Structure formats: C-alpha cells, structure tokens
Amino acid sequence: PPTTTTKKP
Ligand SMILES: *[C@H]1O[C@H](CO)[C@H](O)[C@H](O)[C@H]1NC(C)=O
Ligand SMILES: *[C@H]1O[C@H](CO)[C@H](O)[C@H](O)[C@H]1NC(C)=O
Ligand SMILES: *[C@H]1O[C@H](CO)[C@H](O)[C@H](O)[C@H]1NC(C)=O
Ligand SMILES: *[C@H]1O[C@H](CO)[C@H](O)[C@H](O)[C@H]1NC(C)=O
C-alpha cells in the first residue's frame, strides 16, 4: 500500500 518516507533531520 501507499508508503511514506521520512525527511532526514
Ligand atoms: C514508500 O516506501 C516504500 C518502501 O519500499 C517504497 O520505497 C515507496 O516507493 C515509498 N513511497 C514513496 C511515495 O516514497
Ligand atoms: C510516512 O509518513 C506518513 C505520514 O502520515 C506516516 O507518518 C508514516 O508512518 C511515515 N512512514 C515512516 C516509515 O516514517
Ligand atoms: C521521504 O524520502 C523520499 C526519498 O526520495 C522523498 O524525498 C520524500 O519526499 C520524503 N518525504 C518527506 C515527507 O520528506
Ligand atoms: C526519516 O526519519 C525516520 C525516523 O526514524 C528514519 O530515521 C528514516 O531513516 C529517515 N529517512 C531518511 C531518508 O533519513
């Protein structure tokens, strides 16, 4: 399913 990525600090 639609996954999401996190923005690196
Ligand atoms: C969400 O994470 C999955 C993990 O395999 C995929 O990398 C997918 O391309 C990601 N979706 C987006 C929009 O970056
Ligand atoms: C990607 O972002 C979505 C936004 O709702 C969620 O926070 C999800 O948990 C995130 N995925 C990761 C691996 O942090
Ligand atoms: C998560 O990382 C992916 C990797 O290309 C994309 O840069 C995406 O825009 C990122 N998501 C957020 C919320 O920064
Ligand atoms: C986005 O933040 C999450 C929160 O733990 C993870 O560290 C993930 O590895 C980060 N993504 C990037 C591209 O640094």
Q: Hey, what long-range contacts does 1-7 have (CB within 8 A, 24 or more apart)?
A: none
| Ligand 4 site residues, Cβ closer than 6 angstroms | 6, 8
Indicate which technique resolved this structure.
NMR
The whole-angstrom separation of Cα 1 and Cα 5 is 13
CA 2 from centre of chain: 10
Residue 4 alpha carbon to ligand 1 centre in Å: 6
| Ligand 2 site residues, Cβ closer than 6 angstroms | 4, 6
User: At residue 9, what is the residue type?
Assistant: P
The whole-angstrom separation of Cα 4 and Cα 6 is 7
Residue nearest to atom 5 of ligand 3 (CA): 5
By residue count, the chain amounts to: 9
Q: Ligand 1: does its nearest atom lie under 6 Å from the Cβ of 6?
A: no
